[PDB]
């Protein structure tokens, strides 16, 4: 009566270690990944439904951990800049500088160490206002992190380009994927297929806007753990890109300073041509249409005649109040208030966002490990696809939404929401009419 069957097609929810694969000096060491399958297979499961939950998906946690650990390993061999924690004697840059950019750059000089222990050298360099603090309340200044953390120079040969990786299941596991074009992140998913590896995902880091991800295939999607709870984020995925063009219109020079045997510091040298403010342009008509689509869908949760208003972010550190990104190797902090300034009532041009630049970066919102971004010579221009927003509710007929930042995890759960990891359990039994 009891018949034992091996190879039974059943599974259970499971948490395991995933490995990366890559389709082939990068900060994320993507060369360390397993080469991908040039033609991966996908199997449709007929008559199979499954329950998914993107808010409890541990694939997000592994991606978060791998990214931070790789980032830290990439700085391990790079030169430390601790000899720079000196008193800087410093004044402003006033040569051909545009107003409202005036006061942003400073010309500082100091006594730096050199190749021999017995010698000192006088050097000078330019710094951005956001990287220094005044101590002598020319005036004495110090680098902003000298009383809290070590500063490590990023290696100039290492790229920060967000080259995508694929996550792949180990033997004994499978990754289930949703195909439902309207899936909102939780509950039954009527159309499921299996893959061994995920689509390539770019480890892009941003705050208020998501700059280079996937677009919704059909309708604009609004996803949240609750919607109702004002303590939760709302992730909005666009079904069309919004093009954004960013620039740093200052032709800079770069020079190296030897600070000890085998070690050098890269300093901003001087500026060729006039000094101008960094900025980003967003097409105006596209932005307007894009919000109109978002509002029509937000209203489904708030009421047919509910008014929706957008407002800018709350006060706080640039890292949480501005739109930040790494592009061309520079770290931009842009003012987004021009994008969130409207009230939506029931029934060519551009928006220019001014930006600030910082060289001393606390990359993962951790304290004690500061990275110094060496300057880049020449002029930087970037073009990217805005694919979505992170919004919060500002919380009786009007709702107000504000952009905001969030955990790094929220920028990855937006791509991994369709995937689930299960383990295969091949043994099972059933009654039959046979006996040995």
């Amino acid at each position, epitope marked *: 009566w009891v018949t034992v069957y091996y190879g039974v097609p059943v599974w259970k929810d499971a948490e395991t270690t995933l490995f990366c694969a890559s389709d082939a000096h990068n900060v994320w060491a993507t060369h360390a990944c397993v080469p991908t399958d040039p033609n991966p297979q996908e199997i449709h499961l*007929e*008559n199979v439904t499954e329950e998914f939950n993107m808010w409890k998906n541990n694939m997000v946690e592994q991606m978060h951990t791998d990214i931070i650990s790789l980032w830290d390993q990439s700085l391990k061999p790079c030169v430390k800049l601790t000899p720079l924690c000196v008193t800087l004697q410093c004044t402003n840059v006033t040569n051909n500088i545009t107003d409202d950019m005036r006061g942003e750059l400073k010309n500082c000089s100091f006594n730096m160490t050199t190749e021999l222990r017995d010698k000192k050298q006088k050097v000078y360099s330019l710094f951005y206002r956001l990287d220094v603090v005044q101590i002598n309340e020319n005036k004495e200044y110090r680098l902003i992190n000298c009383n809290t953390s070590a500063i490590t120079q990023a290696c100039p040969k290492v790229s920060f380009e967000p080259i995508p990786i694929h996550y792949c299941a180990p033997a004994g596991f499978a990754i289930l994927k949703c195909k439902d074009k309207k899936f909102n992140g939780t509950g039954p998913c*009527p159309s499921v297929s299996t893959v061994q590896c995920t689509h390539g995902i770019k480890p892009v880091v941003s705050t208020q806007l998501l700059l280079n991800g996937s677009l919704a295939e059909e309708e604009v999607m609004i996803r949240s753990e609750n919607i109702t709870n004002n303590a939760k984020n709302i992730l909005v995925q666009f*079904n069309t890109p919004v093009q954004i063009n960013c620039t740093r219109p200052n032709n800079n020079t770069r020079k190296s300073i030897r600070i000890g045997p085998g070690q050098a510091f890269y300093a901003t040298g001087d500026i060729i041509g006039d000094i101008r403010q960094a900025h980003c342009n967003v097409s105006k008509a596209t932005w307007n249409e894009t919000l109109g689509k978002v509002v029509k869908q937000l209203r489904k949760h708030f009421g047919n005649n509910t008014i929706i208003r957008f407002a800018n972010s709350s006060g706080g550190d640039l890292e949480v109040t501005t739109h930040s990104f790494n592009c061309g190797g520079e770290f931009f902090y842009c003012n987004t208030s021009g994008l969130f300034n409207s009230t939506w009532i029931s029934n060519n041009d551009s928006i220019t966002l001014p930006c600030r630049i910082k060289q001393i970066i606390n990359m993962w919102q951790r304290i004690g490990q500061a990275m110094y971004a060496p300057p880049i010579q020449g002029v930087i221009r970037c073009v990217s696809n805005i694919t979505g927003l992170i919004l919060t509710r500002d919380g009786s007929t009007t709702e107000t939404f504000r952009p905001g930042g969030g955990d790094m995890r929220d920028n990855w759960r937006s791509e991994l929401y369709k995937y689930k990891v299960v383990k295969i359990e091949p043994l099972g039994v059933a009654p039959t009419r046979c006996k040995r």
Partner: antibody, heavy 119, light 112 residues
């Protein structure tokens, strides 16, 4: 609410473009604009669909690149471009509007009188 | 990629009384079925959606049910109400994950 045009006789190997104009509603909202065809003999089959909210479209397997479906919210119309036509493509073509909301999701509720294409 | 099979191709009745039409999906469509009535000379009219809900352009005379991959339509009383060809339509293509891919079976001619 749906008015079709562009029917007529196609010399075999030629092309023909059909149109369907919306009246009384906007294509700027989330609707599916789809074409089906009814063969002489009353066989009925799906040809293609486009989502007006994005321009995304799906085609029947038998199309194999011979048909292109698109929409324009500024004209408030949708069209179907057919090429490499043969005698077998003779049919009454119809446009219909499917809803994108929870009730009637994917359901064609609005149908226009169709138009005849012969080849 | 969903194929619907409709049977019988020809159904008839004496005037008064009921007939049925069956339709079988090649794969479960999780009840994403619509029924249409096409009289000669017009486009099909929608009678029933999501397997059993009426459009109110049709009376209780047209009833139906089903789930998964198998559905039926019952016409409770035939008063020479029509000489329509009835069609079974899938409104959801599970192989894509959308409502943008439709399939029709052949129709059934009802004679009375």
């Amino acid at each position: 609410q749906l008015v079709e045009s562009g029917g007529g006789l196609v010399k075999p190997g030629g092309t023909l473009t059909l149109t369907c104009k919306a009246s009384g509603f906007s294509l700027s909202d989330s609707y599916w604009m789809c074409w089906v065809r009814q063969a002489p003999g009353k066989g009925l089959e799906w040809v293609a669909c486009v989502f007006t909210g994005n321009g995304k479209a799906y085609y029947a397997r038998w199309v194999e690149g011979r048909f292109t479906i698109s929409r324009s919210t500024s004209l408030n119309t949708a069209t179907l471009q057919m090429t490499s036509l043969t005698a077998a493509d003779t049919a009454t073509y119809f446009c219909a509007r499917g809803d994108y909301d929870d009730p009637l999701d994917g359901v064609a509720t609005l149908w226009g009188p169709g138009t005849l294409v012969t080849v | 990629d969903i194929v619907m099979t409709q049977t019988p191709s020809s159904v008839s009745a004496a005037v008064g009384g009921t007939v049925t039409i069956n339709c079988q999906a090649s794969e479960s469509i999780y009840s994403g079925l619509a029924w249409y009535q096409q009289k000669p000379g017009q486009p099909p009219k929608l009678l029933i959606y999501r397997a059993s809900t009426l459009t109110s352009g049709v009376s209780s005379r047209f009833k139906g049910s089903g789930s998964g991959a198998r559905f039926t339509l019952t016409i409770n009383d035939l008063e020479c109400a029509d000489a329509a060809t009835y069609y079974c339509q899938s409104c959801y293509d599970t192989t894509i994950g959308t409502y943008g891919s439709w399939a029709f079976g052949g129709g059934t001619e009802v004679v009375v």
